[PDB]
């Protein structure tokens, strides 16, 4: 059945508002897509405040009113027979695609213990380029959680969009790590017959720009942007970062003064 972890808040610093929130014990995208309708008999809930969230109580649950609370953001009446200022609008608060998904990942969904277990990057949700179908009435105008709870709970992003978020975080990090790790191995293995230190700084500071410059980092982000959440047709691509860096790492002729030549060029175009 459904074990749901409800991250909740209250007007009087602790009604209850589940401002983000549900898993089933296994033994991956599609099952969650089948749970985020638009799907469980029993909703056993762990109500939590700020892993980075600590359970405060547990309720076994009328799945009707609970599903209402999870879906149209309604607050549970203390129907429950079973912290910081609404701050929460400054942090995690650029817009929807961040406010509803990164809050649910950071504080709630690193229980899957992915390599994303680790920061509040709010920097992978933006490479999460799922199509935005707009809606009116999304005027923040929120200062004393229902005003933000409704906002959160009825947005299209959190559906198949929500189910594909942890998977995309993992995929993001996987490709990023393979490229940065290959680059780091090439940087380290080239620090081992060594040059007069005058251009050793020229080597370090120029390699760390021939592989992580702003333009090539943008190219990588393009090669790792995702448009449809379904992992099947996800629009990612092989990243050029390693392949376009190995344009610079042809220091194998240095096995049978060049760094400042490339330094002078790069410096000119920059």
């Amino acid at each position: 059945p459904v074990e749901v972890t409800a991250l909740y808040a209250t007007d009087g610093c602790v009604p209850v508002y589940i401002f983000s929130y549900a898993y089933t014990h296994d033994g991956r995208f599609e099952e969650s897509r089948a749970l985020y309708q638009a799907n469980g008999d029993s909703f056993r809930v762990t109500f939590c405040l700020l892993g980075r969230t600590r359970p405060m109580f547990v309720c076994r649950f009328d799945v009707a009113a609970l599903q209402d609370a999870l879906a149209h953001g309604t607050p549970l009446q203390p129907h429950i027979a079973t912290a910081q200022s609404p701050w929460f609008l400054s942090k995690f608060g650029p817009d929807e695609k961040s406010l509803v998904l990164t809050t649910r990942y950071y504080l709630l969904q690193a229980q899957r213990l992915g390599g994303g277990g680790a920061q509040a990057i709010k920097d992978i949700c933006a490479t999460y380029a799922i199509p935005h179908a707009p809606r009116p009435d999304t005027v923040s105008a929120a200062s004393l959680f229902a005003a933000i709870t409704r906002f959160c709970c009825t947005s299209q992003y959190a559906g198949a969009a929500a189910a594909g978020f942890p998977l995309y975080v993992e995929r993001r990090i996987a490709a990023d790590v393979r490229e940065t790790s290959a680059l780091e191995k090439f940087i380290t293995h080239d620090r081992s017959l060594r040059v007069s230190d005058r251009e050793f700084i020229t080597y370090i500071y120029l390699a760390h720009f021939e592989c992580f410059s702003p333009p090539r980092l943008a190219t990588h982000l393009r090669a790792v942007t995702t448009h449809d959440p379904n992992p099947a047709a996800s629009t990612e691509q092989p990243s050029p970062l390693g392949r376009e860096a190995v344009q610079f790492f042809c220091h194998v002729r240095a096995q049978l003064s060049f760094f400042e030549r490339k330094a002078s060029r790069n410096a000119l175009e920059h």
Binding site: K91, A120, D123, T180, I187, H208, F212
Partner: protein, 381 residues
């Protein structure tokens, strides 16, 4: 956008965790008695030689190199007590992602006025084993560690064994061991779960080695401390600058920091800021010569403030927009002042501190170059 950091803090958190989990053997733990014993002495001559075990991780780099975001990540992944050298660093590392006090406050600070160095001492074996070193460091704060030892025997260190200490350049070498001792002296007093667990205090000192002997020099430089903490496996350096966006000036601050030969081209460059503005910050090289604006700057409002400091007092300070150092008494001294303002459209100087005779120190730079050459030291851009 900074991104390579999100992937360089990762290996750091691995080593910091490997160090925060390990448990010592049986005897290698300060027994509680070892503290009343220190409180039982009148001259730091009765101190028995013996290790207080510890491990440390170094996060070092230029000002504005991305050390702050590494602290931000470690604070929110590892359970740590985050602290700073001086209230500048405390108000710096203080909250934009998800309190913080000085490391002096953590072990407590009457304890201000200190006749440090009063009592004497000399080492023994030339490659002094840590036990020789701490024997000296505890002596240095006699009448400081002494009151601390007597009072506590008559608790933020007891929460976690990872202790973030930003801006380690402001703390002398005698604060590496003190923060060790007053950690062990507190965990062994209350018998916290850390003490039962045989955990060594993992200190993470973050600060600029060449831009401000301090803790960083005491670790980077001593051979026994390097062999004990394995700084080859415990060092990560932030090669970057997100506030210098000009090629020539960035090359000056790079020939200075890492200690490579000055060039007549660099001299020619520096002969462009010499100027013998009401905003340019007047840094100096004498605490009298800063009050000297009692005459010139003060009462200049009669006829018609971070503005006045010394270069060695502006280390770790934050400035927006003129070095007037006394000649003959100045290469690692200007580097402190020239790097305050972000760009060279606000720096001013009075003597060309690269053609004028000066005083250049190169031990820290030599170690930094050898460290970057080391295959096991993390480098982050």
């Amino acid at each position: 956008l900074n991104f390579t950091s999100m992937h360089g803090v990762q290996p750091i958190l691995k080593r910091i965790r490997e160090l925060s989990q390990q448990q010592l053997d049986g005897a290698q733990v300060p027994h509680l008695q070892w503290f009343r014993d220190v409180a039982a002495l009148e001259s730091p001559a009765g101190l028995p030689l013996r290790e207080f075990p510890f491990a440390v991780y170094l996060i070092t780099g230029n000002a504005g190199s991305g050390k702050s975001t590494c602290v931000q990540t470690i604070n929110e992944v590892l359970d740590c007590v985050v602290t700073g050298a001086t209230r500048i660093a405390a108000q710096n590392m203080y909250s934009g992602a998800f309190p913080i006090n000085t490391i002096f406050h953590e072990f407590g600070f009457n304890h201000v006025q200190a006749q440090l160095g009063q009592y004497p001492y000399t080492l023994t074996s030339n490659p002094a084993s840590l036990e020789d070193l701490q024997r000296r460091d505890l002596t240095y704060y006699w009448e400081v560690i002494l009151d601390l030892t007597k009072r506590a025997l008559a608790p933020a260190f007891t929460r976690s064994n990872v202790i973030v200490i930003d801006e380690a350049g402001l703390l002398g070498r005698h604060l590496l061991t003190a923060v060790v001792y007053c950690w062990w002296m507190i965990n062994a007093l209350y018998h916290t779960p850390q003490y039962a667990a045989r955990l060594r205090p993992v200190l993470v000192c973050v600060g600029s080695p060449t831009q401000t002997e301090n803790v960083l020099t005491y670790l980077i430089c001593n051979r026994t401390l390097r062999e004990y903490a394995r700084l080859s496996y415990s060092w990560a350096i932030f090669i970057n600058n997100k506030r210098c966006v000009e090629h020539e000036f960035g090359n000056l601050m790079k020939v200075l920091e890492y200690g490579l030969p000055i060039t007549e081209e660099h001299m020619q460059f520096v002969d462009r800021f010499v100027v013998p503005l009401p905003g340019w910050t007047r840094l100096f090289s004498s605490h009298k010569e800063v009050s000297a604006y009692m005459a010139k700057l003060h009462a200049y409002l009669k006829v018609t403030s971070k503005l006045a400091m010394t270069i060695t007092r502006s280390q770790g300070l934050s400035l927006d927009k003129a070095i007037c150092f006394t000649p003959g008494n100045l290469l690692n001294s200007a580097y402190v002042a020239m790097s305050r303002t972000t760009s060279s459209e606000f720096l001013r100087m009075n003597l060309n501190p690269l053609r004028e005779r000066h005083e250049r120190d190169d031990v820290i730079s030599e170690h930094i170059l050898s460290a970057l050459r080391d295959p096991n030291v993390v480098i982050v851009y």
